[PDB]
């Protein structure tokens, strides 16, 4: 049935498994080239007069939205969009499904229950505001917003949850309980897993992997609500293999295509297709208390710079 070239921005393992599973189902000779979302965006833009791939799969949706704005993508609404929550059906800036959401990374925190059992604390924290408990002094970690996008997602989430003023009040009250602002977004997951801290804040699928490997972690989607990142799929405008690109978007949005991502592809993000079985270490998306994250507003470089600078000035250095 021909061939398909994928620019993949997910992991190598997830990409390889998607290519193999797609090729098996549809008998399309499928290959991928893996690169980060930013590098991939630059490549697609550079190659726009003679595109070298058919589809862009995985990684954050925001750069795919920006490519849609620049006329680099081909709009196509898969019938499987019917199986995605209205909220996530057409999430990018230019409407018409130039891009679609294939998974979601949920911001939350996880608690080391063994270490909790040593702090004299009997109940597992279930809310963001539980983390200001003075019993948790020196027992929480989150990444440094200056060096980590994960921590910036936290800032933007709190700002959308409570307004910017109360978000920074919350950071001020959380601050005395933070033992380390880590350089990397994922470090609090490794540290909470090993008992180097009690609570780590970050993307829940990272804590899930530590739990999979045996760490005594309880994952929490905080009670007040929370934010997230989305994974995207998009067809390139001028794709050499447009028919097969549409089949691949169908597949990436399908029950089987999304299930295989965690069943064999080692991905632990929550799936956007509401008919899909979730990993036992992921979540039931329709039941989650999620803000509607405004990526257009908070993804702008000037707003991001401003909010990080405010965090530095008022939290880190005040
Ligand atoms: Cl099922």
Author numbering: 1 to 318
Copy out sentences from the published article reporting this entry, exactly as the authors wrote them.
In this study, we investigate AfuABC (Actinobacillus ferric uptake ABC), a BPDT originally identified as an iron-specific transporter in Actinobacillus pleuropneumoniae, a Gram-negative upper respiratory tract pathogen. AfuA is a class II/cluster D periplasmic binding protein with two globular α/β domains linked by a dual β-stranded hinge.
To gain insight into the mechanism of ligand capture by this PBP, a structure of apo (open)-AfuA was solved to 1.6Å. Substrates such as G6P or F6P first dock to the protein via hydrogen bonding to residues in the electronegative region of the binding cleft. Next, the negatively charged phosphate group of the ligand serves as the target of a simultaneous rotation and closure of the two globular domains of AfuA, generating a stable AfuA-ligand complex.
